[PDB]
Amino acid sequence: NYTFRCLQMSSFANRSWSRTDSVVWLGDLQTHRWSNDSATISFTKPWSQGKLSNQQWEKLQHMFQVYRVSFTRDIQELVKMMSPKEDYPIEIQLSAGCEMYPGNASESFLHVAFQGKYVVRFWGTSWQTVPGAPSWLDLPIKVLNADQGTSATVQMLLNDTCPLFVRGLLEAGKSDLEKQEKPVAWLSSGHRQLVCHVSGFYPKPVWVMWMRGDQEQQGTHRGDFLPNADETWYLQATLDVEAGEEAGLACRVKHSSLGGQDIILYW
Amino acid sequence: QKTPQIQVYSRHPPENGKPNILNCYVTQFHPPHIEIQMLKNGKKIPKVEMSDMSFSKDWSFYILAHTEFTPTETDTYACRVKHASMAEPKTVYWDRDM
Numbered sequence A: 001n002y003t004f005r006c007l008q009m010s011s012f013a014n015r016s017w018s019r020t021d022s023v024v025w026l027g028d029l030q031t032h033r034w035s036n037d038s039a040t041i042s043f044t045k046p047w048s049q050g051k052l053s054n055q056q057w058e059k060l061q062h063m064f065q066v067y068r069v070s071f072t073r074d075i076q077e078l079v080k081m082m083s084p085k086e087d088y089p090i091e092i093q094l095s096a097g098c099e100m101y102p103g104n105a106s107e108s109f110l111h112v113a114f115q116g117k118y119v120v121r122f123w124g125t126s127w128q129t130v131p132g133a134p135s136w137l138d139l140p141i142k143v144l145n146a147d148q149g150t151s152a153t154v155q156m157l158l159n160d161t162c163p164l165f166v167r168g169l170l171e172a173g174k175s176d177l178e179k180q181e182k183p184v185a186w187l188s189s190g191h192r193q194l195v196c197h198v199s200g201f202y203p204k205p206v207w208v209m210w211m212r213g214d215q216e217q218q219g220t221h222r223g224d225f226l227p228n229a230d231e232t233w234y235l236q237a238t239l240d241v242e243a244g245e246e247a248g249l250a251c252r253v254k255h256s257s258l259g260g261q262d263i264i265l266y267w
Numbered sequence B: 001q002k003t004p005q006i007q008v009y010s011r012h013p014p015e016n017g018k019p020n021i022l023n024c025y026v027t028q029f030h031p032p033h034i035e036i037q038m039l040k041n042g043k044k045i046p047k048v049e050m051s052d053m054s055f056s057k058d059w060s061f062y063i064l065a066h067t068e069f070t071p072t073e074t075d076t077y078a079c080r081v082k083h084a085s086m087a088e089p090k091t092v093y094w095d096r097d098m
């Protein structure tokens, strides 16, 4: 399962200042960036164009270029109309894309948040407010829904463009997507918290456990997965022990990249 | 409005005198405007690289900062974060293990 997410972040500070920036992810790998300051969508992989021809890419990009300008105008105009009831500063976020399933096609999504709260989605053939969204949104969404050409374009992008472009990305980015990077591990710490650090692994799935011989220590607390800057992962696993019980303990790491040869680090 | 969480950890095992990379992962903040510095002995490190800002499923923002560092037992390292959710800057010191 690969989830393609286009993530748009728009900050409207006052009447004269706004910016829209975007990032695009295929799973946990960034494929695109689109800065406010740039007219064009930037590639963050050699394969970020997928299977698309140069002309096909320029057209899709052109459509996003038109959209970014229209969206910025639409929001400023909306705020003017709503004033002073809805006012600056304003944060709008969009999360749109598709989740690719094994063999069988895909589901697509387009979610919109206002001031950090989910408020609007596109679903089926129309935009809709979600239950609990501020009621002042109902009127502008009804208006947006009257725009058939936009609705047709959005339906096309979600249902067709997204899974097709992503199937192209999966092919073109295969060696990157299927890359294997080996973890490196190290230990640190009368009641000690023992810490097993595991860094530099890719892909994300990993198994890290404190052991006494062959016995898994169920007191092992796994931390959050933290990103390294080099598209690899960092994880720690901690075990709370009493003093003079540390002897015979080990941290064991299993990961796809290691080829059945676990890391075992004895305290 | 949500308070940034700060996590400071190294890319490779921290060995004294060996060049390494220190990470500062800042998460769960809103709004996205944020100021992030990394510190050596309380002073700002000049060359700190930043990931693009992005956001999670729950819509909270995250960003990764990182800098080259050589740990020694005479140097402290920290990540300092300024954000509207907080009255003063929040500093998290590298705990020398992470």
Ligand SMILES: *[C@@H]1O[C@H](CO[C@@H]2O[C@@H](C)[C@@H](O)[C@@H](O)[C@@H]2O)[C@@H](O[C@@H]2O[C@H](CO)[C@@H](O[C@@H]3O[C@H](CO[C@H]4O[C@H](CO)[C@@H](O)[C@H](O)[C@@H]4O)[C@@H](O)[C@H](O[C@H]4O[C@H](CO)[C@@H](O)[C@H](O)[C@@H]4O)[C@@H]3O)[C@H](O)[C@H]2NC(C)=O)[C@H](O)[C@H]1NC(C)=O
Pocket: A106, A107, A108, A109, A110, A122, A123, A124, A125, A152, A155, A156, A158, A159
């Ligand atoms: C793109 O795909 C859309 C569906 O996919 C979902 O949404 C997209 C955006 C992605 O997020 C994807 O991942 C999602 O899964 C698709 O939307 C569908 O469009 C058709 C018509 O074009 C809709 O059919 C009409 O349904 C209503 C009833 O709707 C309700 O009931 C059903 C269950 O019974 C639910 O699924 C809905 O949520 C609603 O609660 C009918 O009343 C209506 O019948 C009338 O109209 C037809 C002509 O169209 C006449 O023949 C009849 O006699 C009636 O007069 C339609 O049959 C469908 O609801 C809608 N799906 C959803 C989930 O809303 C969209 O069309 C695709 N677009 C393109 C360009 O490919």
Ligand SMILES: CCCCCCCC(=O)N[C@@H](CO[C@H]1O[C@H](CO)[C@H](O)[C@H](O)[C@H]1O)[C@H](O)[C@H](O)CCCC(=O)Nc1cccc(CCCCC)c1
Pocket: A063, A066, A067, A068, A070, A071, A074, A092, A094, A096, A112, A113, A114, A119, A120, A140, A141, A144, A147, A148, A149, A150, A153, A154, A157
């Ligand atoms: C990620 C979605 C990208 C899809 C591209 C949308 C197509 C587009 O750029 N349409 C704008 C020009 O429309 C004209 O040209 C079209 C063909 O190029 C058609 O022919 C169309 O008929 C014609 O009108 C259009 O201006 C559109 O409205 C852009 C707005 C995008 C949008 O959501 N706005 C929006 C508006 C209100 C509310 C929300 C979400 C709630 C936010 C909380 C405040 C979002």
Ligand SMILES: CCCCCCCCCCCCCCCC(=O)O
Pocket: A006, A007, A008, A022, A023, A024, A032, A034, A041, A060, A064, A068, A094, A096, A097, A110, A157, A158, A161, A162, A165
């Ligand atoms: C609306 C989502 C459609 C997905 C179609 C896949 C082709 C998108 C290519 C990624 C570049 C878009 C980056 C801009 C993000 C935005 O402003 O919404």
Ligand SMILES: *[C@@H]1O[C@H](CO)[C@@H](O)[C@H](O)[C@H]1NC(C)=O
Pocket: A013, A014, A016, A017
């Ligand atoms: C609008 O907001 C920006 C960014 O927050 C700020 O620097 C600027 O002073 C404001 N501009 C005006 C004209 O008030």
Ligand SMILES: *[C@@H]1O[C@H](CO)[C@@H](O)[C@H](O)[C@H]1NC(C)=O
Pocket: A017, A018, A019, A020, A036, A037
């Ligand atoms: C962002 O880009 C738009 C269009 O190029 C521009 O008008 C606007 O001033 C930019 N905003 C900032 C904050 O740079």
